[PDB]
Structures are given as C-alpha cells and as structure tokens.
C-alpha cells in the first residue's frame, strides 16, 4: 500500500530529499517533517536497509520523532532526520560524507545534521568540510562536550519529576530502580541514583559492562528477561526501543517508567496499557531530550554549564506533561504529543506579524 505522498499528506511532512553520488556510492534520504519552529535538526544515521522502502519509512518515522522531541524540549528547531543506506563497517569514505554534506548545504540550513547511529565526530568533520549546517564538531564541544552525562542528567531530572507526582516527594532516597542496559548514558544515570541513596537492579547484553556497574554502585545483576518482572518502584529502559510491549508490560511491578531509550513504546496501545495498568509512563522524547538540547546549544557557541542548566528543566517539562494528562484526561504519551503540538501552533501564531528580519537559531548561517 505504502505511497510516499499519501504518508506525507496523512502525517503532514514538508520535504523528503533523495541524494546519490557515483564515486562514493552514496544513497541518502533527508526527511523534513515540520519547520514551523526553525531549521530541522536530526542525526545522520547509517544502516544496511533491506530495501529503499525500509530506509524511507525509518527516515520519515525518525523525522516526525524529532519534531516532537525538539518542540517539547522548547527548542527553536523542526523535525528532520537523515539516513545513508550501506555497511558502516566497509562503505564510509571521505567522498561519502563530503558528498552528503554538500546535499545538506543544498537545503540552505533547512536541515542541520549531527552524529547518530553508525556515525562519529570524524564523519561529521567530513560533512563540516562542505557545510556549517552540522553540529557536535566545534573545539568547545570537542573539549568539554562529552554528551552521555547530559542525556543522563535529563533522564535523572525527568524521573525526579515523575516521583514527585506518584510518591508526593521528588526524593529517590531508598527507591529501587530496575535499569535495562548499562551503556554510557545509563552508567551516568546510575551515578546520580546511587548518590541519592537508591537501590539498582540492572541487566546488559555485555558482561564487562555489568561488573563495572556492580563494582561501582553495588547494583544487583539480573537476567535480560527478568528485568520487567523484578520488584522495583521505577523501570528505566536505557538499551533498546519497543521494550514496553504486549509481553513486558503485564510483568511490570513498578509505578513509573523513566529511561533514556528512544521509542520505548512498540505501539501507541502500549502507552494506553501502561495507563490502564496505573503506571506513569514518562515519555521517551521528553525525558531523553538532553542529547539534542546539548548539540542545539553549540549553534549559539557551546557552553556545558548553560546546556546543563537548560536540561535541569526536563523536570518542569515532565511535570507539564503530567498536568496536561490530568487536565485534558489523556494518557502521558498523548499529553506529551499535545504539549509539543500546542507549542508549535502557539509560536506559529505569536510570530505571525511581519518583520524585515526574523531572528532564528542559525547565528551566522553558512
């Protein structure tokens, strides 16, 4: 059934750009959903898609995702995402990333790219050779801009906010948090949680990762399949997405979900289930926004203190989604979508009077 244009119509996508270069064998999709708030910011992601169609669907899905992520995050950015089709192991060249960066320069700052999955500051520095519409590449972001602890602080602050609602106190003192995954971002969330005096049950597909964790925080290890059934107050999915589904959600003994993974929900039903089951689902794209807020900050000359003080406010953003769920009698995830759509609409109206020059987040556009 799937028709590029019927999807763009139904979902209201602005632009989808297909890019090819001969010598680099570049096949790239830049997807731009909504730019009401400003330039579309979204990671470049490289992957071995089975078909053109697989890649388009992923590009579109992830682009609309950034529209909500960025809008809710209070950022003056739209929803975009780019995607290269190929083997990240074998097909990265200079020409690949230069050619792509040229096609990013072609859109004259409607798309701003950054590192995502299977792409690195090294790749972005090739893009940077052709365009200034790339972020996470400056000396300031290079020196003291190491992103993991900032995403983590976002998630930490958002969890605090959720706890205030259900428990009546934002203290995570003597709370048990089930933590799926102990990657960089998770490891740093564990640190804030241990320092507040919280009990940590964890899992990971990696053994060295697990032992580093139990060594440093004294966390009880548990089997990948057990983590959902475990007896804890808060579940924190920080590994993969679609971890909240038909199979896992009935197991949950927790009162809050508050993790770092993108697209925790496998389907929207799973949002409404967590609802019926009386579990407060603190939505992905609100809580883990810290990552995008960090690169967005570079656009204005990077300052980690300012980034952290802006991410500190993920608490206030979560608390607003809760308020909106109660007030509009909606499930958390649909309240977060509303909050983002309310803001887009509001600023589309509040800035609809003529100025010879409107100020946007591109300082010196290049």
The rounded distance, in Å, linking the Cα atoms of 230 and 270 is 19
Q: In Å, how far are 85, 116, 360 from 129, measured between CA atoms?
A: 21, 18, 23
Other Cβ atoms within 10 Å of 267 Cβ, number: 12
Q: How far is the CB of 252 from Ca ion (least distance, A)?
A: 21
Rounded to whole angstroms, the Cα distance separating 311 from 73 reads 9
Asked if residue 174 belongs to a known ligand binding site, the reply is no
Tell which residue, 100, 134, 110, 108, has the closest CA to residue 13.
Answer: 110
C-alpha 364/C-alpha 307 separation (Å) is 20
Q: Of 33, 120, 118, nearest to 81 (Cα)? A: 33
Question: What is the smallest separation between the CB atom of 21 and Ca ion, expressed in angstroms?
Answer: 5
CB of 119 to Ca ion, least distance (A): 13
Our CB check for Ca ion shows the closer of 101 and 291 to be 291
94/82 Cα distance (integer angstroms): 18
Strand partners of residue 202? 179, 221
In whole angstroms, give the CA distance from residue 363 to residue 13.
26
Q: Which H/E stretch holds residue 327?
A: helix 314-327
Minimum distance, C-beta of residue 357 to Ca ion, in the bound complex (Å): 32
Binding site for Ca ion (CB under 5 A): 21-22, 25, 65, 68, 291
Residue 184 labelled as part of a binding site: yes
Nearer to Ca ion, 99 or 230 (CB): 99
Catalytic residue among 27, 64, 69, 81: 81
175 is catalytic: no
Nearer to Ca ion (CB atom), residue 68 or residue 228? 68
Comparison of 65 and 78: residue with beta carbon closer to Ca ion: 65
Bridge-based pairing state of the strands 26-34 and 15-21: antiparallel
**Is the separation of the CB atoms in 285 and 158 below 8 Å?**
no
Q: Whole-angstrom Cα distance, residue 80 to residue 65?
A: 8
Is 134 annotated in some ligand binding site?
no
> Min. distance of Cβ 109 from Ca ion in angstroms?
22
Residue 42 or 201: which CB sits closer to Ca ion? 42
What is the number of the residue whose Cβ is closest to Ca ion? 291
> What residues are labeled active site?
81
Annotated binding residues for NAD(+), written as ranges, equal: 181-186
Annotated binding residues, written as ranges, equal: 181-186
């Amino acid at each position: 059934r799937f028709s590029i244009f019927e999807t763009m119509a139904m979902e209201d996508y602005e632009q989808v750009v297909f890019c090819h270069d001969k010598v680099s064998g570049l096949k790239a999709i830049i997807a731009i959903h909504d730019t009401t708030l400003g330039p579309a910011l979204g990671g470049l992601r490289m992957w071995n898609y089975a078909s053109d169609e697989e890649a388009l669907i992923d590009a579109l899905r992830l682009a609309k995702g950034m529209t909500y992520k960025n809008a809710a995050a209070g950022l003056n950015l739209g929803g975009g995402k780019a995607v290269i089709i190929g083997d990240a192991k074998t097909q990265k060249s200079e020409a690949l990333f230069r050619a792509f960066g040229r096609y990013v320069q072609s859109l004259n700052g409607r798309y701003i790219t950054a590192e995502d999955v299977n792409t690195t500051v090294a790749d972005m520095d090739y893009i940077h050779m052709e365009t200034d519409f790339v972020t996470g590449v400056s000396p300031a972001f290079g020196s003291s801009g190491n992103p993991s602890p900032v995403t983590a602080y976002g998630v930490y602050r958002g969890m605090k906010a959720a706890a205030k609602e259900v428990y009546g106190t934002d203290s995570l003192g003597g709370k048990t948090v089930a933590i799926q995954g102990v990657g960089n971002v998770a490891f740093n969330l564990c640190r804030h949680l241990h320092e507040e005096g919280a009990k940590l049950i964890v899992t990971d597909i990696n053994q060295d990762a697990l032992r580093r964790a139990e060594e440093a925080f004294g966390a009880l290890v548990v089997g990948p399949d057990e983590i959902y059934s475990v007896d804890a107050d808060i579940f924190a999915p920080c590994a993969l997405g679609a971890t909240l589904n038909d199979e896992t959600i009935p197991q949950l003994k927790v009162k809050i979900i508050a993790g770092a993974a993108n697209n925790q929900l496998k389907e929207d039903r799973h949002g409404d289930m967590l609802q019926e089951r009386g579990i407060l689902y603190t939505p992905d794209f609100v809580i883990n926004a810290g990552g995008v807020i960090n690169v967005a900050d570079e656009l204005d000359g990077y300052n980690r203190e300012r980034a952290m003080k802006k991410v500190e406010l993920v608490y206030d953003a979560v608390a607003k989604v809760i308020e909106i769920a109660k007030r509009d009698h909606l499930p958390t995830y649909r309240a977060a979508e509303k909050m983002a759509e309310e803001r887009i609409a509001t600023m589309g109206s509040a800035r609809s009077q003529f100025l010879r020059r409107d100020k946007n987040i591109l300082g010196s556009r290049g």
